[PDB]
Design a protein around this ligand. Structure first.
Ligand SMILES: *C/C=C1/C(=C/c2[nH]c(/C=C3[NH+]=C(/C=C4\NC(=O)C(C=C)=C4C)C(C)=C\3CCC(=O)O)c(CCC(=O)O)c2C)NC(=O)[C@H]1C
Ligand SMILES: *C/C=C1/C(=C/c2[nH]c(/C=C3[NH+]=C(/C=C4\NC(=O)C(C=C)=C4C)C(C)=C\3CCC(=O)O)c(CCC(=O)O)c2C)NC(=O)[C@H]1C
Lengths: 313, 315
C-alpha cells in the first residue's frame, strides 16, 4: 500500500520504506507556478496554492469564492467540452491567457473525478522539431538513435546533461547515451539499482509522461486547504507537473550537484522502456512551449525505439 | 502481375492506360507543381545544375545568373547547415527545413534532401495549442473507431479541407474508408471499399518511405525541370522525396472526374507496412502552407503509434 502523507501524520521517509512514499499526494507544488482546484460542475474554486496572489494578482479571498465562469469567461466552456466527466486523468487541455497582471500565462487543466486541476505558469509569444523528427527516423540503429535523441534534446534545451536511461527487465537502469557540457562527470555506461527509481514512481511514469524539478533547493508551496473539501481527502496531483517533487529525490539531486532536472518517459508496449533524463547545474524553469516539444519527442522516440528494436529481433 | 517501370515519356516511354497501370515511373516525372520552385545542386561543390522553369519568378533572378553561382554564394547562411544536416551517404528520406527571408519573394520555406551526389532544394512561400490538445485526445480515445473519428475531425479542423478520410488497406491492398469528416452536403464514402489498383503497387511502395504528398490544383500544368536530365548522370532526376514533384496525369484525371480540386494524404505506417492513409479532398484548388503541413506530418507519426496501441488492445 502507501503510508499516509506527512501532513496527515504518516511516517517520514527513509531508505527502508522507499516503495511506500505517496509521491502523488504531497499537498504542495513548486513555486514557479500556481495551482487552483475547482468543482467540475459549478466551476467553484475549492483549493489554491498559497502563492496564487502573486501570479494571478488577486486579493486572496477573492479567488476562493469565485467561479471559473467568472474568473475565466472565454475558457470555461472549452474546459467543459475538452474534459468531459469520466475522462482519464491523463487527458490535458492547454491555453495561453493574456492576463492583466502577467503578460502571458500558460494554463493546463486536467480532471480527476469531480475536480478540475488548473496550473498556471508564465509563458511567451521553429524547424528544429521537424529536423529532429527526420533525424531520429533515419538513425540506422538503436545506438545511433539514442545518440541523436540526447544531442537533439540538449540542443533544444541547453540542459547541462541529457541521457537516455534504459530499464533492464528487473528495473535496473543503464545510461546508454549521453550528451553533456564539457567538464561534467560522464554517466555513460553506468548502471544503477532498480530502487533508485522505485516501483510506485515507475507506475506513475507510465501514465504521466513528463516531470521536472525546476530548483532542487526551493521550498514547496502548500495547497490551502490541504484536503479537498469535496472528499475531505488529499487532492491527487499525479498528473500535475507543478506537483512538489519527493524530498527523498531532491536530496539525491542535491548530493549529485544538480540544480534542475527533467525527464520524459519512453513507453513501449504499455511498459516503461526508459527515460530521457536531463540535468542542469543551476535552477532552470523550462517554459511550457519548449516542454511540449520534448513531450512530442517522447512519443516519436517511443515509436522509433519499437521500429529499431524490431530490426534487430 | 508486377513488372518493371517504363522509361518516362521524355525518354520515349509509352503513354499510360488502364492496362499498364503499375508501370508508370511516377518518381521521375521531370517536372513539378507550379506553386513552388525546385533547384538541384552538386552535393560536394554546390554547383546549381537543374531548375524548374518558373524558378526566376520565385527567386527573382535570371536562370543564367542562378546557374552561374554555387549554393555557397546563393545561401551563405544555410550552405554549412545543409552540409552538416545532410552528410554524404545519408538516406533520401532525411529532410532539412529552414525559413529564408528572400528580397523579392517574402518568407520562403526551404526543404532540402540528398539523393546520392545530388541536393534537391524546394522553395515555397510560407506564412495555438491545437496540436498538443489533439495529441492528448488521440491518446485518450477508447478504441480504434473513436481514434479514427477524432483523427479525421482534428485534421479537418486544422486544415479546413472539405473531406478528410481514414483509408485503411486490407491484406489484398484493397482499401476501405473507415472514418471521415466531411462538409455539409457531400455524400458519404464511409464503409465503401475500392479495388487494389486504385492506388497501385509502385505507389504504395513510395508511400511507405515518403509519407506526405499532395496535388494542390488538379488542373494545373506541371513545370519542367531545365534541363530535364541530371547533367551528372545524363539520367532522370529522382523526385520521389520532393513534395513539389508533379502528380501522375492518370491520377490527376481520376481526381478531376470526382470533382476534386485539391488532394493531400499522409501515410500511416505500422510495423514497416503501409497500414492506411489520412486522405483529404477539397473541391477547389487549395495550397496548404508548409508549416501547417508539418502539423499533419507530426499527426501521421502519432497516429502510427496509437494505431499500434489500439490494435494490441484487440486480439
Ligand atoms: C528511497 C528512494 C530513493 C529514490 C526515490 C525516487 N526516485 C524518483 C525518481 C527518479 N530517481 C532517479 C534516479 C537517478 N537519477 C540519475 O541521474 C541516475 C543515474 C545516472 C539515477 C539512477 C531518476 C532518474 C528519477 C526520475 C525523475 C527525474 O528525472 O527527475 C522518485 C519520484 C520523484 C517524483 O515523482 O517527484 C522517487 C520517490 N531515489 C533513490 O536514489 C533512492 C535513495
Ligand atoms: C491505371 C491508373 C490508375 C491509378 C493510379 C494512381 N493512383 C495513385 C494514387 C491514389 N489513388 C487514390 C484513389 C482513391 N481516391 C479516393 O478518394 C478513394 C476512395 C474514397 C480512392 C480509393 C488515392 C487516395 C491515391 C493516393 C494519392 C492521394 O491521396 O490523392 C497514383 C500515384 C500518384 C503519385 O504518386 O503522384 C497513381 C499513379 N488509380 C486508378 O484508380 C487507376 C485509374
Amino acid at each position: 500500500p502507501f503510508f499516509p502523507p506527512l501532513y496527515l501524520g504518516g511516517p517520514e521517509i527513509t531508505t527502508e520504506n522507499c516503495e511506500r512514499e505517496p509521491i502523488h499526494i504531497p499537498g504542495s507544488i513548486q513555486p514557479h507556478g500556481a495551482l487552483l482546484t475547482a468543482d467540475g460542475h459549478s466551476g467553484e474554486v475549492l483549493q489554491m496554492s498559497l502563492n496564487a496572489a502573486t501570479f494571478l494578482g488577486q486579493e486572496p479571498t477573492v479567488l476562493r469564492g469565485q467561479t471559473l465562469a467568472a474568473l475565466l469567461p472565454e475558457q470555461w466552456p472549452a474546459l467543459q467540452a475538452a474534459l468531459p466527466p469520466g475522462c482519464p486523468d491523463a487527458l490535458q487541455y492547454r491555453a495561453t491567457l493574456d492576463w492583466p497582471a502577467a503578460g502571458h500565462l500558460s494554463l493546463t487543466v486536467h480532471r480527476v473525478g469531480e475536480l478540475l486541476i488548473l496550473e498556471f505558469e508564465p509563458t511567451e509569444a521553429p524547424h528544429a522539431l521537424r529536423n529532429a523528427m527526420f533525424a531520429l527516423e533515419s538513425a540506422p540503429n538503436l545506438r545511433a538513435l539514442a545518440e541523436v535523441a540526447t544531442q537533439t534534446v540538449r540542443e533544444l534545451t541547453g540542459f547541462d546533461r541529457v541521457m537516455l536511461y534504459k530499464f533492464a527487465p528487473d528495473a535496473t537502469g543503464e545510461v546508454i547515451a549521453e550528451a553533456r557540457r564539457e567538464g561534467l562527470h560522464a554517466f555513460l555506461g553506468h548502471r544503477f539499482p532498480a530502487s533508485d527509481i522505485p516501483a510506485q514512481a515507475r507506475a506513475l511514469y507510465t501514465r504521466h509522461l513528463l516531470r521536472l524539478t525546476a530548483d532542487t533547493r526551493a521550498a514547496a508551496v502548500p495547497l490551502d486547504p490541504v484536503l479537498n473539501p469535496q472528499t475531505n481527502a488529499p487532492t491527487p496531483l499525479g498528473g500535475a507537473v507543478l506537483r512538489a517533487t519527493s524530498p527523498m529525490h531532491m536530496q539525491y539531486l542535491r548530493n549529485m550537484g544538480v540544480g534542475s532536472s527533467l525527464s520524459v518517459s519512453v513507453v513501449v508496449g504499455g511498459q516503461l522502456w526508459g527515460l530521457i533524463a536531463c540535468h542542469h547545474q543551476t535552477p532552470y524553469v523550462l517554459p511550457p512551449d519548449l516542454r511540449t516539444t520534448l513531450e512530442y519527442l517522447g512519443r516519436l522516440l517511443s515509436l522509433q525505439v519499437q521500429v529499431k528494436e524490431a530490426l534487430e529481433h
